[PDB]
Amino acid sequence: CPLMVKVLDAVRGSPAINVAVHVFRKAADDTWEPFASGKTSESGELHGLTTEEEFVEGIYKVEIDTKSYWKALGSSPFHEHAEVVFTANDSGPRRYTIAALLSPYSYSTTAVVTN
Amino acid sequence: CPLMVKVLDAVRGSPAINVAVHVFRKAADDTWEPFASGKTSESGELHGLTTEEEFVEGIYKVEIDTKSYWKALGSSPFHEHAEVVFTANDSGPRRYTIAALLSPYSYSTTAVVTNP
Amino acid sequence: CPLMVKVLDAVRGSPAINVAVHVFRKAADDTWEPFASGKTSESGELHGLTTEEEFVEGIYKVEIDTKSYWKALGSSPFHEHAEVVFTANDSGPRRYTIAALLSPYSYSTTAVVTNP
Amino acid sequence: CPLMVKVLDAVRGSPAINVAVHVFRKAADDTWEPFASGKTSESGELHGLTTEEEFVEGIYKVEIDTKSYWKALGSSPFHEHAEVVFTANDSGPRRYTIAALLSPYSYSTTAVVTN
């Protein structure tokens, strides 16, 4: 599992559950090709998005549906979504955890890139 | 000044200076149209992107070129950029400050929205 | 104004107003001595805590009463407060902005340190 | 394991390894009683600090030695340490993960409190 996404709710101090996540790969035309998607589990985690074979070097975009999340919970959110865009390269570490910490008007994202 | 961007460097504890910022608006046909652009000043602030008259209701995307920033300082950053996408002015005109706090593998963004 | 504190509310996207802030200095005997205190203004800023003359080298602790803030707004926050502890002025006088971004179960703090 | 501490390095996008962590409980005199301590593992995690029996309601302080961390890595840090102070109460969720995300001049901390 070379790409994992983990989402936390900073208001309630919990996993952000059933958050929709879509992953895209940049195509040679520079448009965004759907690659993978899923919803975060009860632990705020989304595993099994891709495989080592499929997850080649390229520029990837991870779009987190934060607006839908806050809407279901009765909170008026600022952002339409949280976008994370990065280049996956073969030379260094290559398990990627994209972590997102969510508030109605703020989010932070952090990549933990390990062996 | 209804739209302002402030960018801080969390490694140096300083404003993040000369960071390129591009702003787009979603058009009727659902494409991103160029709206404004600029660079942060010595104070890490970017003012004057737009005017009250021009800054109508819409979905806006603020793209902060964090990669060029970190690269020019010798670091090899994780993100291509930091994108902030939001609906603006749909309860009427507001003033928006988009704050970004930058580290090589992490960033946070915050909106401060005030009533003029 | 060598020491300033700015506090933002990440739930409301607004400055965090009327937040109590207490500042202590570590004394020769290793105890925390009261140094200054105040409340954030309508802009979430707290200015005038000290002067250049008074703000000598030392280890300082800035205690932000986030609990009372969230409690008065109906939320039941996780933290008792947000503490920021730092050595000041040991390469000579600097100006310090301590920024805190607040959520009920999370906060981040950032220092912007500039050369007067 | 009702108290877990997890530390990340936002500069390198990795676990913050071998970070010293001390936990204190507030005594009735209002002084801070050493309770538990440890160093973060290779995954940035510190488990086994306490047990359900020992971890009674009270006010706890978790002190993370961030300065030593940055110093060993050649980065000039701002903070003397990162302090997290909270009340542990019996009524709601009670596994606590204290997460810290570290930069030289900034840190964020987040509590994930689950069943």
Side-chain angles (χ1 to χ4, degrees):
Chain A
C1 208
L3 178 56
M4 193 276 267
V5 175
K6 178 175 189 173
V7 190
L8 299 179
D9 180 321
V11 180
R12 286 164 212 81
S14 65
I17 303 154
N18 223 242
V19 177
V21 179
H22 297 258
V23 186
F24 306 83
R25 211 176 158 291
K26 209 174 196 173
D29 66 7
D30 278 352
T31 76
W32 290 107
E33 216 174 289
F35 169 75
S37 68
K39 277 181 163 293
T40 56
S41 76
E42 79 163 325
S43 74
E45 281 159 325
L46 179 52
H47 303 268
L49 286 168
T50 187
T51 59
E52 295 187 324
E53 315 259 65
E54 302 180 76
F55 189 51
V56 298
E57 292 186 284
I59 297 165
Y60 289 84
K61 172 177 73 157
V62 175
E63 212 150 60
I64 304 158
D65 197 339
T66 60
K67 196 180 186 184
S68 292
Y69 181 72
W70 294 120
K71 283 215 221 163
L73 290 174
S75 304
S76 199
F78 178 75
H79 305 87
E80 287 294 298
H81 49 254
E83 289 154 333
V84 175
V85 184
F86 60 100
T87 301
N89 97 279
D90 278 338
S91 321
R94 304 147 84 259
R95 289 188 164 252
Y96 292 87
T97 292
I98 303 293
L101 172 71
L102 308 186
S103 305
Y105 275 71
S106 180
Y107 68 83
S108 81
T109 189
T110 299
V112 183
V113 188
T114 62
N115 192 266
Chain B
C1 205
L3 184 56
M4 188 267 276
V5 178
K6 182 169 172 71
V7 187
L8 299 178
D9 178 331
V11 172
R12 271 135 69 115
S14 73
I17 294 154
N18 299 152
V19 177
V21 179
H22 291 264
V23 185
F24 305 83
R25 187 178 175 279
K26 205 176 210 179
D29 63 3
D30 273 331
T31 66
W32 290 110
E33 296 182 320
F35 179 79
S37 68
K39 267 155 181 178
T40 57
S41 69
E42 276 198 349
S43 69
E45 297 175 325
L46 173 50
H47 299 271
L49 277 166
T50 189
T51 64
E52 207 154 14
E53 313 67 73
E54 189 180 73
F55 194 44
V56 295
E57 289 190 76
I59 299 174
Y60 292 81
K61 168 172 79 164
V62 174
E63 197 191 319
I64 300 172
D65 186 11
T66 64
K67 189 185 187 172
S68 296
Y69 182 76
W70 291 119
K71 282 178 83 290
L73 290 170
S75 321
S76 284
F78 178 78
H79 302 93
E80 282 307 295
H81 60 249
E83 277 148 351
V84 176
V85 186
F86 65 100
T87 300
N89 311 303
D90 78 337
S91 295
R94 300 285 186 277
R95 284 186 174 112
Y96 297 88
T97 294
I98 306 306
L101 169 66
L102 305 189
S103 299
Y105 276 65
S106 183
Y107 67 84
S108 68
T109 188
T110 295
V112 183
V113 182
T114 58
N115 214 320
Chain C
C1 205
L3 184 56
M4 188 267 276
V5 178
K6 182 169 172 71
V7 187
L8 299 178
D9 178 331
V11 172
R12 271 135 69 115
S14 73
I17 294 154
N18 299 152
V19 177
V21 179
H22 291 264
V23 185
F24 305 83
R25 187 178 175 279
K26 205 176 210 179
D29 63 3
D30 273 331
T31 66
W32 290 110
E33 296 182 320
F35 179 79
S37 68
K39 267 155 181 178
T40 57
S41 69
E42 276 198 349
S43 69
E45 297 175 325
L46 173 50
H47 299 271
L49 277 166
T50 189
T51 64
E52 207 154 14
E53 313 67 73
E54 189 180 73
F55 194 44
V56 295
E57 289 190 76
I59 299 174
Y60 292 81
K61 168 172 79 164
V62 174
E63 197 191 319
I64 300 172
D65 186 11
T66 64
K67 189 185 187 172
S68 296
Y69 182 76
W70 291 119
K71 282 178 83 290
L73 290 170
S75 321
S76 284
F78 178 78
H79 302 93
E80 282 307 295
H81 60 249
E83 277 148 351
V84 176
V85 186
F86 65 100
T87 300
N89 311 303
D90 78 337
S91 295
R94 300 285 186 277
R95 284 186 174 112
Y96 297 88
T97 294
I98 306 306
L101 169 66
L102 305 189
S103 299
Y105 276 65
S106 183
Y107 67 84
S108 68
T109 188
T110 295
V112 183
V113 182
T114 58
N115 214 320
Chain D
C1 208
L3 178 56
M4 193 276 267
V5 175
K6 178 175 189 173
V7 190
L8 299 179
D9 180 321
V11 180
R12 286 164 212 81
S14 65
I17 303 154
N18 223 242
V19 177
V21 179
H22 297 258
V23 186
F24 306 83
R25 211 176 158 291
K26 209 174 196 173
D29 66 7
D30 278 352
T31 76
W32 290 107
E33 216 174 289
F35 169 75
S37 68
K39 277 181 163 293
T40 56
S41 76
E42 79 163 325
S43 74
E45 281 159 325
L46 179 52
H47 303 268
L49 286 168
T50 187
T51 59
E52 295 187 324
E53 315 259 65
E54 302 180 76
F55 189 51
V56 298
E57 292 186 284
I59 297 165
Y60 289 84
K61 172 177 73 157
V62 175
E63 212 150 60
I64 304 158
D65 197 339
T66 60
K67 196 180 186 184
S68 292
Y69 181 72
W70 294 120
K71 283 215 221 163
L73 290 174
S75 304
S76 199
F78 178 75
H79 305 87
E80 287 294 298
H81 49 254
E83 289 154 333
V84 175
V85 184
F86 60 100
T87 301
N89 97 279
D90 278 338
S91 321
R94 304 147 84 259
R95 289 188 164 252
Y96 292 87
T97 292
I98 303 293
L101 172 71
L102 308 186
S103 305
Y105 275 71
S106 180
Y107 68 83
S108 81
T109 189
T110 299
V112 183
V113 188
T114 62
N115 192 266

